[PDB]
Design a protein around this ligand. Structure first.
Ligand code: NAG
Ligand code: NAG
Ligand code: NAG
Lengths: 101, 97
């Protein structure tokens, strides 16, 4: 229904992760990604946090997807997608970063 | 260069939160609440609490109004300026009963 859906992601240190938040049924209602520190990454199609590694895969009413390139072990953690229905709905994607053997 | 200030409001009253940037190009401002929920991202409303309104948004100022305040609204609101790296200024909202 009108609920944000995300999945856990696993990526190798140095590789590129893609975090995807989807909504089955939606209008206008805005989506937003934040990082483990709760800082905003994108608000719909508008970049927030300047970090040149974080870029926009897709922004629409049904999808908000972002790529983190050249990931490091310190990107590991819980990312949150928020959809601004009243009350707000959230869904978490835990990003795991594997070291190179 | 984000600059905000502590604000006092009597319970049931309306508080205004103002964030100021002395010189700015086209870098974004965002207010968020003590839970860290985004309220306004520039002129774009986020959290849907219909008590929260936009007073003013431009590159030099982001101001929002909280009408009808309650005791649970008390605390640290943060203004963010998305420079590289990000800069923040907190305003503390005191609500008296
Ligand atoms: C996603 O990751 C967290 C990491 O601890 C975990 O609790 C959760 O179960 C994971 N999702 C699953 C198992 O579907
Ligand atoms: C989307 O458009 C509506 C019209 O119903 C506009 O008034 C409103 O601000 C937007 N609503 C959102 C973002 O929830
Ligand atoms: C704003 O409020 C907090 C905590 O009550 C305080 O630490 C800060 O100094 C305050 N602002 C002033 C004194 O202007």
């Amino acid at each position: 229904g009108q609920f944000p859906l995300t999945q856990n992601v696993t990526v190798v240190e140095g590789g590129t992760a893609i975090l995807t938040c989807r909504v089955d049924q939606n209008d206008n209602t805005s989506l937003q990604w934040s990082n483990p520190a709760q800082q905003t990454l994108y608000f719909d199609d508008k970049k927030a946090l300047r970090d040149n590694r974080i870029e926009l895969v897709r922004a629409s009413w049904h999808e908000l997807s972002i790529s983190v390139s050249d990931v490091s072990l310190s990107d590991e953690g819980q990312y949150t997608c928020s959809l601004f229905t009243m009350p707000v709905k959230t869904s978490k994607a835990y990003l795991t970063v594997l070291g190179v053997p």
